[PDB]
Write a protein that binds this ligand. Structure first.
Ligand SMILES: Cn1c(C(=O)NCCO)c(Br)c2c3c(c(-c4ccccc4Cl)cc21)C(=O)NC3=O
Ligand SMILES: [Cl-]
Length: 258
């Protein structure tokens, strides 16, 4: 086996339904990588196509500072593996839980900077005529800290007529209602919520009354003082009218981000 023969497995850092993720050192280049090892879905089936799109997307989103680099992907003999860049600072999710336990969140300067960087990662993706569809703190990773979008498992072409939904906590309603005219804006919606989490909000709701309020374009309580301008940027990012949310390009050129 190539995984065993080419890498030294250091530690498990991720455990899913389908997969697992390991910190490993490539024996030949001495260098450390994150490798997701997951079940090989039956050749030529809906689930296979899902896994292949991930490999396809990683393979074209490899020039970017705000997307995790892909090094390789292979299959053996009942598993599928992808070898990506390892991010020494771990995930945005874990930084936010640590933050939450200590009552010390991302400051406004840090939140702008997270939004700008991830916004740059999205701009890129959208310019590759793709969309990510599952932006959330556990799919953002950290390496001046660099934030990098990871987990392209939901990535699809911008004008897809069929879509798998990302996490409901971060899901725009128009997508829930199978309206796929402005998918790039689904990522914009999720980015804002991600940044809301970064600011120290309570865990986001999955369903029920509070799930809908936000989808009306109402921000969750943020336990700290943010400038009105920045709060406005945030609000417009979760606007019920996806056309009213700024593209990623608008996002990174926004004055509040200069
Ligand atoms: C769960 N996880 C963690 C982690 O939580 N570490 C503990 C500290 O918080 C990292 Br870092 C990480 C990393 C990746 C993935 C991953 C996602 C989807 C598909 C394939 C992969 Cl390889 C999952 C990852 C990655 O690609 N690059 C990483 O650094
Ligand atoms: Cl998350």
């Amino acid at each position: 086996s190539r995984y065993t023969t080419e890498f030294h497995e250091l530690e498990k850092i991720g455990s899913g339904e389908f997969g697992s993720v390991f910190k490993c050192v490539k024996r030949l280049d001495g260098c450390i990588y994150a490798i997701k090892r997951s079940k090989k879905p039956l050749a030529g089936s809906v689930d296979e196509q899902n896994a292949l799109r991930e490999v396809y997307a990683h393979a074209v989103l490899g020039q970017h500072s705000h997307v995790v680099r892909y090094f390789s992907a292979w299959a053996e003999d009942d598993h599928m593996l992808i070898q990506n860049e390892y991010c020494n600072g771990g995930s945005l999710a874990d930084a936010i839980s640590e933050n939450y336990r200590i009552m010390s969140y991302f400051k406004e300067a840090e939140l702008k900077d997270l939004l700008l960087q991830v916004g740059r990662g999205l701009r890129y993706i959208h310019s590759m005529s793709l969309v990510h569809m599952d932006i959330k703190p556990s799919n953002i990773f950290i390496s001046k800290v660099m934030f990098k979008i990871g987990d392209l498992g939901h990535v699809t072409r911008i004008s897809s007529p069929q879509v798998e939904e990302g996490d409901s906590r971060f899901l725009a309603n128009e997508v829930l209602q199978e309206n796929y005219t402005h998918l790039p804006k689904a990522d914009i919606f999720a980015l804002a919520l991600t940044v809301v989490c970064a600011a120290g909000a309570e865990p986001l709701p999955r369903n029920g009354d509070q799930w809908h309020e936000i989808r009306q374009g109402r921000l969750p309580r943020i336990p700290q003082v943010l400038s009105q301008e920045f709060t406005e940027l945030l609000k417009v990012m979760i606007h019920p009218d996806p056309e009213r949310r700024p593209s990623a390009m608008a996002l990174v050129k926004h004055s509040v981000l200069l």
